């Protein structure tokens, strides 16, 4: 079976053609693959299909390295567009796909970035889950001895929003762990450190959910802008640096969706005998 | 640039034929590639080279995550020769190879094995090296309150082979780090933890020098056998269970090389645009 293997500022991927050849898995063969010293090492599978309504160019579904199905909105999306240009299953710049989550058009920049609409941020409590009195722009919660303010928001998955004078001298690797499991958050959270630069910047680092801290989590920036936008601190059009490069987020505000955009990486093609 | 990636027993190499192509590395260049998020993601890399010498088919030399050249005897060696034959650069069952640590002869089997020379072991304690008055078959050591009884030897690294009743039940991770930098190991040791199920079968568990425990040594494997076998516990031709899987050793004992008998799998082969 061919394959590419692809990141999205260091998210890595086994990304797979299923419209050229039969791409056959189960959730054994999945987990093997998956294994970084045993098979070909990845966080996520994502295989491309051909569309299963007409009116779509792709289908394409994710799974994750215990061989279960991932629905994220925007998990994915970047490397999945520049695979299907690189391949040569499409010329088009703006794709039409499928996914878990429903459908949307994803568009690759003049730049070979790609665009995502990830949606509108769901500030409500319950929505999160959040454990709160009602919607705020500031919550308070306590980390053992230490006060926190931070803004709470879904983008489809939950986010604890931080702001820092530092991302480097954040105690990422002590209150992440405190605030990820939280009783205030029944289904955990993504903690952003987030260090506004200017209206138009930030830096940021981000303790996730159960994985810690990683290079970049794209949802979190989302979060940490669609927060600082609502805390009046952010433009709506935002750098954000993570610890392993740049996006860039979009966002009108309420009534809008959010957009993405960032890049993907090609980082090899390969063939795996399976037979 | 195509490669290979293979693991020997869980041991994962990049491996690359710069026989048939110019392939060119750098330092920084194998520390984003051994990247298991940005790159191929591996623990060493192989590189397969011509021998310019008539009387070798091959030379290979080996680098680490952090772009280091690599010496260590018997390193690779395996899925070195299964790679040079599924990609049709030999077909040779017996090939003759230069390394970092010398030449040697490796045979694949019928079965699509490799067959290693890892030379003769050294009990001579000077050469480990392990501070005691002399060679002797069983030493008496203390880690700590502890009273272990071990056998020490060099496969052109160091080794402490202690025999359980039990691998599982063994102490890997607190006799492991107290043995492995013991003052008596002044260049620190691999530590061995052999539970012999029959004369022609072990179960073995290694604390790596600098690595702490690993799936599979297959120095260690060797090791246990050299040690087993002059202890006179083992028959000449044994299996070792590793966690990672398998190795099958065979000596016949002072004056005679060691041979170490395993896997190598192919696991995929790759393109990386250069």
Not at 117 to 144: D, H, L
Request: hydrophobic residues 40%; glycine residues 10%.
């Amino acid at each position: 079976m061919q394959f590419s293997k692809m990141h999205g500022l260091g998210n890595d991927f086994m990304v797979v053609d299923a419209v050229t050849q039969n791409v056959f898995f189960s959730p054994e063969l999945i987990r093997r693959l998956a294994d970084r010293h045993l098979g070909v090492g990845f966080d996520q599978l994502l295989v491309v299909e051909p569309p299963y309504d007409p009116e779509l160019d792709f289908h394409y579904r994710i799974f994750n390295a215990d061989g279960s199905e991932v629905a994220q909105c925007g998990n994915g999306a970047r490397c999945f567009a520049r695979f299907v240009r690189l391949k040569g299953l499409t010329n088009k710049r703006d794709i039409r796909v499928s996914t878990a989550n429903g459908r949307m058009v994803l568009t690759v920049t003049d730049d070979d970035l790609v665009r995502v609409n990830m949606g509108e941020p769901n500030f409500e409590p319950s929505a999160v889950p959040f454990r709160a009195n009602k919607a705020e722009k500031t919550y308070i919660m306590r980390a053992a001895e230490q006060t926190i303010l931070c803004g709470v928001v879904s983008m489809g998955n939950p986010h604890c929003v931080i702001q820092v004078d530092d991302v480097d001298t954040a105690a990422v690797e002590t209150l992440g762990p405190v605030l990820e499991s939280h009783e205030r958050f029944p289904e955990r959270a993504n903690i952003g450190f987030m260090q506004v630069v200017k209206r138009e910047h930030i830096r940021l680092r981000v303790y996730e959910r159960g994985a810690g801290e990683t290079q970049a989590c794209g949802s979190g920036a989302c979060a940490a802008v669609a927060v600082g936008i609502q805390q009046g601190l952010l433009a709506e059009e935002v750098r954000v640096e993570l610890p392993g490069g740049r996006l860039d987020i979009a966002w009108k505000g309420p009534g809008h969706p959010l957009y993405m955009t960032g890049p993907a990486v090609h980082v090899a093609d390969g063939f795996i005998h399976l037979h």
